[PDB]
Amino acid sequence: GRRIRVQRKGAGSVFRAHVARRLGAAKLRANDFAERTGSVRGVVKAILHDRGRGAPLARVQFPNMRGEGRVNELFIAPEGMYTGQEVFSGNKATLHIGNILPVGNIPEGTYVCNVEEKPMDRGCLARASGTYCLVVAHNMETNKTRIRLPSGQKKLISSKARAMIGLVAGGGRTDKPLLKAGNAYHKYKAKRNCWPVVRGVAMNPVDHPHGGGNHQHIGVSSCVPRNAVPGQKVGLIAARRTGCSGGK
Amino acid sequence: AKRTKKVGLTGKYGTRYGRAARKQLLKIETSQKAKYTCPFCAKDKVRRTACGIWTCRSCSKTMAGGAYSLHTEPANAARATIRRLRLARE
Amino acid sequence: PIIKPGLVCIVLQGRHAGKKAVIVEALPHNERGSYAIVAGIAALPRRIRVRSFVKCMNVNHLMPTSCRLENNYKDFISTQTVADVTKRREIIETVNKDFQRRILEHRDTWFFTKLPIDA
Amino acid sequence: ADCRVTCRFHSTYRTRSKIVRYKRTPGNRLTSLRVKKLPNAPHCAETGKQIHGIPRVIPQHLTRQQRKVSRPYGGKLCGSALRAHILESFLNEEN
Amino acid sequence: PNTITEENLMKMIADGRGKKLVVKSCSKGRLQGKVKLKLRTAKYLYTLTVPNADDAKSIVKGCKDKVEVQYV
RNA sequence: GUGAAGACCGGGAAGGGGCGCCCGCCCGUCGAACGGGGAGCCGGCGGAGACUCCGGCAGGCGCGGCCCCCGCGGAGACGCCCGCCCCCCGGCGACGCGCACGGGGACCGCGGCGGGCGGCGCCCCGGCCCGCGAACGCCCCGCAGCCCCCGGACGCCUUGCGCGGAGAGGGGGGCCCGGGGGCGGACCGCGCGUCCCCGGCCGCCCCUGAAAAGCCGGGGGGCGCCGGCCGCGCGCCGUACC
RNA sequence: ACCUCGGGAAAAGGAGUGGCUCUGACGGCGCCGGGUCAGAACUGGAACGGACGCGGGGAUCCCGACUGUUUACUAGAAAC
C-alpha cells in the first residue's frame, strides 16, 4: 500500500505553509521591567493584512527600553484599534481595548484576546478572527484566573499571564458563503496545499483504507480507535458518539 | 430604471450558486461595500480596504473592524462592558 | 487680546520652525492678513555663537506662549527696518549680541531652551 | 515601410526595466531608447505624501540643494506633520 | 553640447578657462545668414550664434591667439 | 547533536570591527546572462562585428594637481548658490488586477509643396517614390494630483465620480509630472484610428499582490568642510552564426 | 411554457440590405473639422452579409446543479 496523503503531508515538502510575503509572527510585547512595574506606551503605526490570516494584524511601535531607538511589535488587532491609538502594555495599564494587562488585574466578564497560556508565553489563546476569551473568576489564594476559552472550555491560567482587551477583528468572516470553488482556491493558496480534498472512497484500495470496491462504500465502521497506527487512522477518530442529533 | 426586481448586486452571479447563497450574499455584500460613518471625522467615508481593515477616505484613519461591517455586534457589546467595568474600578 | 509686544511664540511653519521667537511689533491688520515682526533664536548658544532671525511672520504661523522676554528691541526694529537689505543685517547683529548677553547671564532660560520635537 | 526595430536589450523578455520608446535618428531609421523607470520622490514618514521640492531622480544624481528641503525635518516630515509635532511637544510640556 | 551665454562667457572661457578650438561655421543652407562660433572646452562644445559676420570678427579677435581658430 | 559507519541533522556557543580606546549576542565573495542595478547616443566602416571598431558628442565613477572655504532669501508652501562621520528615525530601490477616461511618443492616413519616376487606345494637377534630426546640456511651459496665503460659503465639478467650516468657491502662488517646445548638438500642415507608455480616478479580494545590496534625507552628538577648474584612469569574462 | 425572477432568448419566427443622385441631424463661431445615424428618389435578367467570415431550430425524458478536472499513446463520461 502507498503512504496515504496524511502520511505524506507530515514530511514537509509541498504540504508546507505558504509563508512567503507574510508580515511575521503576531505576539504580545515581551515581559520586561517597565511592564512588570509600570506601563509602556505604544502608538499603532499601521493596521495591515497578513497573507494567511483573516484577522487583521497591527504594527504598534514601542520605545526601546534597553536603548535609544524604537521597537516595532506586530500584534493581533483587537476591533477598534485605530492609526495613532496610544496602547499601553504593563501591570498598571488602564482597562481600555488594545491595552495589554495581566489577567488578574483585568475584571471578570471582560472580553480579552491573545491571552498567554502560561506566564510570559507572548500570547497563545484567542487569536483567530472574532474570537475572544472571557475572564470568568479570580482565585486570589492560588494566584490563578479561570477564563472561558473560545470552544467554551474553561481553563485556569496564571494571574500573571497577560491578555489584550477586546474581540479580535475580522469577525463574521465565515458567514459569507465562499460561493465558488475559486474563492476556496484563493484562500487556500494563502495558507497551504490542503485543497482540493479527494474522498478516500473515490481512491483505489492501495491509496486509502476506505479504498475502492465496486459500489464506492467504506465497508467497515468509519469510527477508528484512538490507538490506531498512522496509516489506519483515517475515519472518525475516537468518536464518543456519531450522527446528527439535537441537544447539549 | 429599476433594472432587477428582487436580486440586487447578486445579479452578477446570474442563475448560478442557488437562491439561499445569493440571499445571504445580498446582505453580506451590501455591508461590505457600504460607506460607514468615520468614528473620528464623523463623515460617512469609511470603506473596507481588506477583511477586518476599514479606512476613512477623508479622515485618513485606518480602523480594525468586522470583516463585512465596520462594527460587529459582539464588539459593540464588548466595548460597553469594558467602559462600564473600567468606570466601576474608578 | 493675546498677540502683544514682548510675547514669546514658537514658529510653527517656516525655515525657522520649532524655534522660539519674541513679538517685537504687531502690524495693524491689512489685506495681507495679520502679521507680527518677530525676533527669535535661529541657533542655540553652542553645541556644548547665538544666531537671530528678524522677519515679519503671519500670526497664524505663531503659537502664542506665556513667557514674555521684555526687551528694548523695537527702538532698532521697525517696519522700515527688517524690510530693507542691510540695516536688518545690522539689527540681526544687535539682537544676536543681546541674546548672547541674556545667555551669558543665564536669563530667560525658557526662551534659550530648545523645544524637544520628536519624529 | 518596415519599422521593425528588433531588440536593444540583452534578452527579449519585456519586464518593467526592459521598455523602449521609438524616435527617428538623424539617419532616418526608427530607434529604440530605453525608458528608465522613474524613481518615486521621497514620501512623508507620517501621512505618506510625496514631499515637495525634491524631484523624482535617483538622489545619487540630484545635488544637495535639490535632495534637501529648507525646513527643520525638511525631508522626513511634511510642513503639516512637522507643525503638528511642534504643537504637541509644546502643549504636552504645559500639562 | 550647450549654448554659451553670450560673448562675455565665450571670451572669458577663451581667455583663461580650458579651450581647444573655435570653429566658425558660416550660413549653412541659408536657413540663417548668421555665423556660428563653436568652442571645444574639455567638458562641452559651446556655440555662439552671431547674427552679423562683422560681429563675429570682433569676438574672434577677443579669443586668444593660443586658441586655434578654424573657419568653415 | 546523533548514527557501526558512510553520513545526516543543527544557533545558544569566549562566534567581529578603521581604530590605544571605543563599539558589538549569532552565517553566506551561495542562488536570477528574464527580478533589483551608477552611467551611451548618433553617424560612418569591413568579405565575415558593433550599445564593443572609428569619428563626433555626452554621461557615470574614482584618483591626483590646484584654487577654495563652513549659508542665504520668501508671509508661507518652498526657492537658491551641494560639508562629513557615528548613533538613531525614515525615504528610495519596491512592486496586484480590471473596465473606462485623459495626455504624450511612435505608426498610420489625407492635403499642399519641392525633387524623381512609370504608364498612356481614352482620361489624368486622379498613380508610385523620397523629403531626415539621436543620447545629452541649458531655458520655458506641462492636465490631473498635492500644498501655501487671503478669506469665509450649497457651491465647485466627472465619462463615471467626487469634494467642501477638520475650510469650498474665487483670487494669487509653491511642488511633482518616464512629457513637449526653443536653442546647442547639427518640407509645411491637418485628421481618424492603431500600438506602447503614462496620469488621475473608480471597481475588486475569507486573493491584498517579494526581498536585499546600493543610494539618500532628518534628529542628536562630535567634529570641520564643501565646491570649482584641470589632468588622468576604469581591470576580469561573454560577444561569429543558427 | 417554465424559472432559483437573475434567466429562458439570437427563443420561436418575419422583414429589409447593391449602386448612384440627393436631404437631414451632430461639434468650435468668422472659419474650420467629423464619420456615424436616419430619410427620399432613380436604377438593375426578380439583383445586394453577391467572395469571405458566419447558430439550423422546437418538444421531451434520464443523469450530473454549475465553471472546472481526468485515464500523455483505444473510455472527456453520468466518473473526479
Burial A11-29 (b: 16+ CB within 10 A, else e): eeeeeeeeeeeebeebbbb
CA C26 to chain centre: 12
Of A148, A75, A157, the C-alpha closest to A119 is A157
The terminus-to-terminus CA distance of chain D in angstroms comes to: 79
For B81, the closest chain A residue by CA position comes to: A110
**Strand arrangement, sheet containing C20-26:** C51-58, C35-43, C20-26, C8-11, C62-64
Q: Please state the length of chain C.
A: 119
Which structural technique was applied?
A: cryo-EM
Q: Is A47 in Cβ contact with B63 (below 8 Å)?
A: yes
Chains contacting chain E through 3 or more C-beta pairs under 8 A: none
Compute chain E's Rg from CA coordinates: 11
Which residues, at least 6 apart from D1, have a Cβ–Cβ distance to it below 8 Å?
none
Distance from CA of D65 to the nearest CA of C (A): 14
Give the pairing type, strands A162-165 and A111-113: antiparallel
Which residues of chain D have a Cβ shorter than 8 Å from any chain C Cβ? 45-46, 70-73, 76-77, 79, 82-83, 85-87, 89-90, 93
The closest alpha carbon to D80, from D47, D50, D39, D32, belongs to D47
Please report the number of interchain residue pairs, chain C to chain D, with beta-carbon separation below 8 angstroms: 42
Sequence-distant (≥ 6) Cβ neighbours of residue D55 within 8 angstroms:
D41, D62, D66
H/E stretch holding C55: strand C51-58
Cα separation, E10 vs E7, whole angstroms = 5
Rounded-to-integer distance, Cα A196 and Cα A207, Å: 16
Contact D44, D77 (CB under 8 A): yes
Full strand arrangement of the beta sheet holding B46-50: B46-50, B53-56, B62-64
Q: CA nearest A111: which of A53, A171, A52, A160?
A: A171
> In the β-sheet with A111-113, what is the strand arrangement from edge to edge?
A70-76, A56-63, A39-49, A86-90, A100-102, A162-165, A111-113, A133-139, A144-148, A154-158
What does the block give as the cell for E58? 570682433
Instruction: Report the interhelical angle of E6-15 vs E53-62 (nearest 10°).
Output: 30
Q: Which residues of D are known binding-site members for Mg(2+)? A: 53
Resolution stated for this PDB structure, in Å: 3.3
CA distance A71 to A58: 14
Give the three-state DSSP class for B56.
Answer: strand
One-letter amino acid of D8: R
Three-state SS string across chain A, please?
Answer: CCCCHHHHHCCCHHHCECCCCCCCCCCCCCCCHHHHCCEEEEEEEEEEECCCCCCEEEEEEEECCCCCCEEEEEEECECCCECCCEEEEECCCCCCCCCEEECCCCCCCCEEECCCCCCCCCCCCCCCCCCCEEEEEEECCCCEEEEECCCCCEEEEECCCEEEECCECCCCCCCCCCCCHHHHHHHHHHHECCCCCCCCCCCCCCCCCCCCCCCCCCCCCCEECCCCCCCCCCCEECCCCCCCCCCC
Q: Please judge whether C119 and D90 are an interchain contact, meaning their C-beta atoms are less than 8 angstroms apart.
A: no
Report CA(D54)–C1'(F151) in Å, whole number: 30
